[PDB]
């Protein structure tokens, strides 16, 4: 492995606060940053009939979720990673998968 921080979320304008600002700490602030960035957004798509009984003209609804995914890289910091990560914990339903 290397140090790979991934960020996943259910909406945009959530990810951007975490990534695109508040990984500031590793950016130009103290140490090197190699920044790759963002990945295929996936769609989770659940088609569902609209009538609670059997009648009608056979209408439907389609519902959707969006996933959002991000990814950034650091070249062996030796427990500066503690600092860098911990400052943004922010926004409900953003999760942070550090490797």
């Amino acid at each position: 492995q290397r140090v790979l921080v991934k960020m996943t979320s259910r909406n945009a304008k959530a990810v951007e606060n975490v990534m695109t600002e508040l990984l500031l700490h590793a950016r130009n602030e103290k140490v090197v940053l190699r920044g790759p960035v963002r990945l295929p957004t996936r769609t989770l798509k659940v088609t569902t009939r609209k009538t609670p009984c059997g009648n009608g003209t056979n209408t439907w609804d389609t519902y959707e979720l969006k996933i959002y995914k991000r990814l950034v890289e650091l070249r062996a910091p030796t427990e500066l990673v503690k600092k860098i990560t911990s400052f943004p914990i922010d926004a409900g339903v953003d999760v942070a998968i550090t490797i």
Binding site: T8, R10, R42, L44, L65, I67, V93, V95
Partner: peptide
């Protein structure tokens, strides 16, 4: 993942 989201949901 696809799954973590749905858990939270």
């Amino acid at each position: 993942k696809k799954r973590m989201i749905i858990r939270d949901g």
